[PDB]
Design a protein around this ligand. Sequence first.
Ligand SMILES: Nc1nc2c(ncn2[C@@H]2O[C@H](COP(=O)(O)OP(=O)(O)OP(=O)(O)O)[C@@H](O)[C@H]2O)c(=O)[nH]1
Ligand SMILES: Nc1nc2c(ncn2[C@@H]2O[C@H](COP(=O)(O)OP(=O)(O)OP(=O)(O)O)[C@@H](O)[C@H]2O)c(=O)[nH]1
Ligand SMILES: [Mg+2]
Ligand SMILES: [Mg+2]
Ligand SMILES: [Mn+2]
Length: 664
Amino acid sequence: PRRAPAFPLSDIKAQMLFANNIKAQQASKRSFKEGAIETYEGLLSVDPRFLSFKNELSRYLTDHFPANVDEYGRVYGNGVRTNFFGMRHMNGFPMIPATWPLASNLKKRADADLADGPVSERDNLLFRAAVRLMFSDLEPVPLKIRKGSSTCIPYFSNDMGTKIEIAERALEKAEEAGNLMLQGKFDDAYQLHQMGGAYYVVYRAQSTDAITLDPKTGKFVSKDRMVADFEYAVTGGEQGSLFAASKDASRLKEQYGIDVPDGFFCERRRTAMGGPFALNAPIMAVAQPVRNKIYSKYAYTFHHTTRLNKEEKVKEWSLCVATDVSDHDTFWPGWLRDLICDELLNMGYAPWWVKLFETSLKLPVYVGAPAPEQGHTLLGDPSNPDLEVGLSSGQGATDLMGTLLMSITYLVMQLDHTAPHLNSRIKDMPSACRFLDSYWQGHEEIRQISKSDDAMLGWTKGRALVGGHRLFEMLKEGKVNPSPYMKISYEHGGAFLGDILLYDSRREPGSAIFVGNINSMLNNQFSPEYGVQSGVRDRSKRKRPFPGLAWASMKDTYGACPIYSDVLEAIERCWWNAFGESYRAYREDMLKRDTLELSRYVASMARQAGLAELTPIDLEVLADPNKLQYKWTEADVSANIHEVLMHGVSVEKTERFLRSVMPR
DNA sequence: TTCC
Ligand SMILES: Nc1nc2c(ncn2[C@@H]2O[C@H](COP(=O)(O)OP(=O)(O)OP(=O)(O)O)[C@@H](O)[C@H]2O)c(=O)[nH]1
Ligand SMILES: Nc1nc2c(ncn2[C@@H]2O[C@H](COP(=O)(O)OP(=O)(O)OP(=O)(O)O)[C@@H](O)[C@H]2O)c(=O)[nH]1
Ligand SMILES: [Mg+2]
Ligand SMILES: [Mg+2]
Ligand SMILES: [Mn+2]
């Protein structure tokens, strides 16, 4: 049923994805690589003392703090939703092999029994209403750019200077490029404006995955992660094969002579896509304004910040269901892409821009090196973009696409199983927009708070509430998928945006509170996703600019956790056994050092002014700028701090571009 | 060296 066209790096189609410069060329050639990460300055993830520490701490915590999650996934008690064996990984060493990204997910979706388009006219209206509400009255904003991020295909530059030029150029010729694409002249578009080509596969680490201890064997067991081989990938599942990547770390001994203590495994590898910047720029220029709108006007269901911010909304519900979507990104329906594009045209968006947007969502992917002796293959023909990979992470709006899909999906899941008496309110676009608008503002007896696949569905006192309970029960029994669109189920240990929803004996939304996830504190502090890159001189360009700062926001971020104090003590203790030092002291010094260093980057900061002026969010973002791409928004961060991490383009240049794009 |  149509196998995807594939080309070797030697092929001219692949060659053209990389500019005639060192960086680009190395990216294309880059072979498989692995190695211990520098968890903290001067400390390797595989250091014996460290692993030892990790072994004792994980075991002890898991033993003294077993999970407290009821038959309904509600977490009560100690707030622990699972064991602590997640830290038992050799950070820096991936499972082998990584997956080959699927060129088409149509079959994957069908076999999963998911619809190939809106199933009812209502649903069709709702999705289209979602588009109208989201992309309507948008205000221009400067186009911010992450510092030290790669522009990827074709240049692979990191120079903010070059990035800015690249972007500004894009906004100027985006229009001419799009028209080119409307004429089906993709190659011209790519050659003249670098808008097209492919996504460059980058492999992010999931430093902590499921690991269990078999009471029978006394042996540890790492959760299997299925991965598709090249055949499977190019045939959408028709041929080839799916299988568990190997997480066994024994190899480390024989290969690198690294001592591997029993019960430690290789890291899980998530695949990510680096989009061609010339293309994502014009998209990001619209995406941000869309973000601002829904985070403002529809803040009830979309703008979340503090544990209490969340708490307020959820407390007023009679029922709160914590949903969960499996492999959201690879399942994301191509039809939604096309629907959104069609509706945007209707709303009056420039055809060329919509074409750009559409193309960005069906572009080919260049696979680097999923494993030793593997990779360097371009999937899909750049000349005529026709892939269906679902959401492509590096695209300029993957969060909006995910939200647009899941928010409506959840609303529908509610209508379908709990509120048919509302169906009559949705008869046409107008009535639909009106309903959806009211709904997103939290003004109906059914509600939701969400971000892509993570969400909490609520029910106030009313007709729908008895239905909610049946739904939740359907989810518990889990034998029937409540949606025709994605595969939904309840989250075991319900949590939202990193905060666990803590129930008491009542087991009701009103007598509940949001607390940080304790395991996440552990994950972050001992299993970071990247090392400290002490080699990169510019800290603002590192994946972890100021690691030591996280200590300052810790009490704030996790203090509320039921076993906070206990864990800190357990750590302090085990760290002592392992290093003969105070962990507290260690982090305290790191803290002082980084606070001093930070001032060298923050203007307004006296060349030694404390963290007095900084907020907890500021600190967490400075230690992990990644969180700025999912947990928080530019608006939730101190202006002077956001400047350290991001750099923008003239509000004028974007404002002018945005004007030629929007309808009104 | 390698995404939002
Ligand atoms: N641009 C980008 N978005 C990411 C990245 N990682 C997670 N996301 C966001 O998170 C969503 C995917 O949710 P995850 O929980 O990470 O994974 P999943 O594919 O849904 O499935 P699980 O593996 O079962 O959790 C997407 O909608 C993205 O917007 C990443 O590296 N880059
Ligand atoms: N957009 C984005 N989201 C990320 C990224 N890393 C973690 N996340 C968020 O975290 C989710 C699962 O990714 P994990 O890395 O397992 O999460 P974690 O914060 O380490 O901890 P858990 O909540 O216990 O899974 C995603 O659904 C994202 O929303 C990242 O690089 N980009
Ligand atoms: Mg998920
Ligand atoms: Mg997840
Ligand atoms: Mn959740």
